[PDB]
Amino acid sequence: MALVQFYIPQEISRDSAYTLGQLGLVQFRDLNSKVRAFQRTFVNEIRRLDNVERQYRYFYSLLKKHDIKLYEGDTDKYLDGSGELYVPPSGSVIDDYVRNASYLEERLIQMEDATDQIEVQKNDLEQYRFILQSGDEFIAAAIGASVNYVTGVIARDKVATLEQILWRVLRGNLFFKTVEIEQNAFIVFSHGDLIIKRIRKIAESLDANLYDVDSSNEGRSQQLAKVNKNLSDLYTVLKTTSTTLESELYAIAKELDSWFQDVTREKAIFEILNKSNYDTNRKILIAEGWIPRDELATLQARLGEMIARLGI
């Protein structure tokens, strides 16, 4: 029924014939494989080998993202419970597997870059929410422009001291220093509208987010009003992304193991068959035989002492 492919050298050709024999292989004929031009040394199989290397890379990249780690040591058998289930006893069509992994690779790359871009913007605007509210109240210049305020986040009140030290040495005591504890530190410097650049130079060099006005969203009056609606878009758009990713993750985890086992098994067939000259000057016998599929099970039980009984 199903084509099975065996390789050995001619020396254990007899030793092989008997063991195969005792398991229920039929029509055992030793060959080479030149009498099946496609499944012989040619350019064609070598291209298939590349196609499997691409497959291997795609599975690894998808598992990394998913935070599921590779299972290996490999099932390709048909003795096992899992062997029957995660590797179909039928034939393999390379084209289908390539196309399956293509669609998923493309979807993930979108999903992963999109989560990071959406998420970063959200964490910042939620941070600058409280900042613009506190900073306007600290009032009669909340939507002012003739007074300069500098709102800013800083990692801790410790880092803020070092800033205070630069300021006092290099700009004089033209600041009023206030601080509120976050969850970060809200720092506030308050200055003239013509000494901004010099304050800015200090802020850049100690890693502070002291901007003149925090956020690119300011546009309603108050600033905060615009910010709060844009923070409602950010929260719901991140969640939808998380759902599409989750759904697909539960869907393909199981599928990835099955295609991985399938792809391993394709590499092995090509190798058995001789896809390069090297496999040839290492084992010279490749035989052919037909195994009923209701008996496929028993052949895989004994993998073969120095014989490969991995089949279709």
């Binding site: 910042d124 950010l234 758009v237 599409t244």
Partner: peptide
């Protein structure tokens, strides 16, 4: 639709 939302979104906040 999600890809459309994100495209507008990247640009609103810098």
């Amino acid at each position: 639709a999600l890809k459309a939302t994100q495209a507008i979104i990247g640009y609103t906040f810098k």
